[PDB]
mmCIF file of N, CA, C and O in Angstrom:
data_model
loop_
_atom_site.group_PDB
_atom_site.id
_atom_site.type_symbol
_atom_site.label_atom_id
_atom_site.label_comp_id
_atom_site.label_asym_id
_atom_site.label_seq_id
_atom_site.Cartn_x
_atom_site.Cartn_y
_atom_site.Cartn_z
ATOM 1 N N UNK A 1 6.654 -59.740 31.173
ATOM 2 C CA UNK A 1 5.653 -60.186 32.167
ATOM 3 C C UNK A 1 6.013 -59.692 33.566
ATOM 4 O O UNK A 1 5.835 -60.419 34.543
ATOM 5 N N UNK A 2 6.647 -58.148 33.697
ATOM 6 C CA UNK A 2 6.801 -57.864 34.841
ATOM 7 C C UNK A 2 5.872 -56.797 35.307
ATOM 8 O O UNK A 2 5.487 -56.005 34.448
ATOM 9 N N UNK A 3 5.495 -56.665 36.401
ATOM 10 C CA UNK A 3 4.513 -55.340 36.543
ATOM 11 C C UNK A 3 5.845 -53.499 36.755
ATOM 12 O O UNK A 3 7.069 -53.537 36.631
ATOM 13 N N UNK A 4 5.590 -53.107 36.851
ATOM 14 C CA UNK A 4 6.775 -52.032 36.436
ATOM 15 C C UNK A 4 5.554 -50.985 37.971
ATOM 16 O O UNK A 4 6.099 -50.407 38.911
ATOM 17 N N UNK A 5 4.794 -51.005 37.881
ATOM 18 C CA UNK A 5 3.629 -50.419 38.750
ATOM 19 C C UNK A 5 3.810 -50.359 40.442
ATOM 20 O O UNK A 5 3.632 -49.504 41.309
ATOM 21 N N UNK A 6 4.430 -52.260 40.382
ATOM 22 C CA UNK A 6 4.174 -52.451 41.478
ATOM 23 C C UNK A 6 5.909 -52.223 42.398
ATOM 24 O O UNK A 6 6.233 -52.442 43.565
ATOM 25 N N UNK A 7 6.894 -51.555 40.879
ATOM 26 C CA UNK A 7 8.243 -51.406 41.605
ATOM 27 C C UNK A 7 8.252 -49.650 42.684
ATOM 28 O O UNK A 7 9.040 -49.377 43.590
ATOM 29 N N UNK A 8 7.163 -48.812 42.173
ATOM 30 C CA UNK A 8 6.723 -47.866 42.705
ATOM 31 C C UNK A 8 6.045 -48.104 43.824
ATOM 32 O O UNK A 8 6.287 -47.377 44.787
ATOM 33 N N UNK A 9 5.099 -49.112 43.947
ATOM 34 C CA UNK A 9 4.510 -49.345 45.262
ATOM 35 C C UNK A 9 5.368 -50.204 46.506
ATOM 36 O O UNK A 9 5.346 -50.131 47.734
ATOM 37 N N UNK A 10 5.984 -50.892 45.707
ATOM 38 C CA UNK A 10 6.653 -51.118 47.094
ATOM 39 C C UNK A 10 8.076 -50.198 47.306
ATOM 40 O O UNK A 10 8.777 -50.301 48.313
ATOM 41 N N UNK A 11 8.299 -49.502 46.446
ATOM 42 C CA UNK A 11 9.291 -47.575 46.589
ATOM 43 C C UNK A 11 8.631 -47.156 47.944
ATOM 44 O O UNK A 11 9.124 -46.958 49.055
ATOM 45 N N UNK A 12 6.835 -47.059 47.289
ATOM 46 C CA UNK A 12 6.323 -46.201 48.024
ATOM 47 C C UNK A 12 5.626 -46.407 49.280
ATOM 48 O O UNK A 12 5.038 -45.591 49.990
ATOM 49 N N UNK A 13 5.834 -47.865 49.442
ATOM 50 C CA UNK A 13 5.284 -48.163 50.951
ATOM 51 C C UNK A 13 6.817 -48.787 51.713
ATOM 52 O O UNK A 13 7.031 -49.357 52.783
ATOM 53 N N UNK A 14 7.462 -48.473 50.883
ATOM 54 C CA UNK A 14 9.313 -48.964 51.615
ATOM 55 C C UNK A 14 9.284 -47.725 52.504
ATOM 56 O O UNK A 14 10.109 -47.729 53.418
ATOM 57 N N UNK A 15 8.455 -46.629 52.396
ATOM 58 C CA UNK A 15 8.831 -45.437 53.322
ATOM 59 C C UNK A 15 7.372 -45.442 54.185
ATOM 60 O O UNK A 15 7.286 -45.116 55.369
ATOM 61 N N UNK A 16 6.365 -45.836 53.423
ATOM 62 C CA UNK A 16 4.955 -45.955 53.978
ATOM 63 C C UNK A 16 4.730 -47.231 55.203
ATOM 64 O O UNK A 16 3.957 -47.158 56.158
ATOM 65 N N UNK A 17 5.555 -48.281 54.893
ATOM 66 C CA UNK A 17 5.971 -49.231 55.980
ATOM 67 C C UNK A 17 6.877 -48.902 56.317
ATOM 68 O O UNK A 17 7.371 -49.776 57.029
ATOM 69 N N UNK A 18 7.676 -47.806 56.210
ATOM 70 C CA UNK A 18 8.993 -48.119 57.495
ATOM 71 C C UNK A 18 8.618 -47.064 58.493
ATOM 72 O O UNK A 18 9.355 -46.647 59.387
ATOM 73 N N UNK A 19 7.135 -46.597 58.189
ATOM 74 C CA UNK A 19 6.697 -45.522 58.939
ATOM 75 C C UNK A 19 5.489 -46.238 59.798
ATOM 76 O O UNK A 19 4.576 -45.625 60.352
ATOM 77 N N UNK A 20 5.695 -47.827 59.792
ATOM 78 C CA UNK A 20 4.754 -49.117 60.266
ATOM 79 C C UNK A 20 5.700 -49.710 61.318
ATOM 80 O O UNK A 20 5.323 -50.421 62.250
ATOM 81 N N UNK A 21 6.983 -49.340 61.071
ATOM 82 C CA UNK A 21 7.827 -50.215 62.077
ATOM 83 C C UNK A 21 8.775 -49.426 62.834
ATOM 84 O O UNK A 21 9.317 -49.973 63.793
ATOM 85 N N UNK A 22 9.092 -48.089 62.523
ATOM 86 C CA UNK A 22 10.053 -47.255 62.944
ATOM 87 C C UNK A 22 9.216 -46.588 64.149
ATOM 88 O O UNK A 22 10.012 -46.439 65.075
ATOM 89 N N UNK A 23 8.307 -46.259 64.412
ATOM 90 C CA UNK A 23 7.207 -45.939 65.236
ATOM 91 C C UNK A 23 7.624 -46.921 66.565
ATOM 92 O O UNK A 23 8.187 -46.665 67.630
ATOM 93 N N UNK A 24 7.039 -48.244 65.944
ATOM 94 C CA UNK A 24 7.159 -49.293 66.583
ATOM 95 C C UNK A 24 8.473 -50.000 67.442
ATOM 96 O O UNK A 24 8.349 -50.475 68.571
ATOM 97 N N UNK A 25 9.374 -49.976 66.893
ATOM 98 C CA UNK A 25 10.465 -50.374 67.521
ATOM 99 C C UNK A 25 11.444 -49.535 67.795
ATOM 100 O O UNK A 25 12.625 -49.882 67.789
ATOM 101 N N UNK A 26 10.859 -47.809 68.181
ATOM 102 C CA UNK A 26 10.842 -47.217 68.956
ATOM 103 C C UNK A 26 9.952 -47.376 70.235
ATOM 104 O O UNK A 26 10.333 -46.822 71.266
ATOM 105 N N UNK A 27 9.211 -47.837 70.232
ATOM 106 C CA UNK A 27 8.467 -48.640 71.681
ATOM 107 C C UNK A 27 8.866 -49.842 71.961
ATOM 108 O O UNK A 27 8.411 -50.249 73.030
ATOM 109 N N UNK A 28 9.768 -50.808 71.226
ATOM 110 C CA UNK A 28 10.205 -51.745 71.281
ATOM 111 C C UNK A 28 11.594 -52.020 71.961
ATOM 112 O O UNK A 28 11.960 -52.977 72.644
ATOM 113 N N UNK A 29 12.462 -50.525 71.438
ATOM 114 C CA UNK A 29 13.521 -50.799 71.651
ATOM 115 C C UNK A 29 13.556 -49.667 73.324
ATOM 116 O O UNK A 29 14.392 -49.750 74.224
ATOM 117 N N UNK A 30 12.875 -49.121 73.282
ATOM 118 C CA UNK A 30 13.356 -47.463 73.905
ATOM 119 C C UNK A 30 11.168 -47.127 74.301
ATOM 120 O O UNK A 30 10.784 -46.061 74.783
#
């Protein structure tokens, strides 16, 4: 009863969101 699908989507937004916050706290920090 595990989704196996959704270990790829959050793979693939672990780089798709860190491209949500790395942006960002480069205006945050600097």
């Amino acid at each position: 009863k595990i989704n196996k699908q959704k270990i790829k989507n959050g793979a693939k937004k672990a780089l798709g969101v860190a491209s949500k916050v790395a942006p960002v706290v480069a205006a945050f920090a600097r």
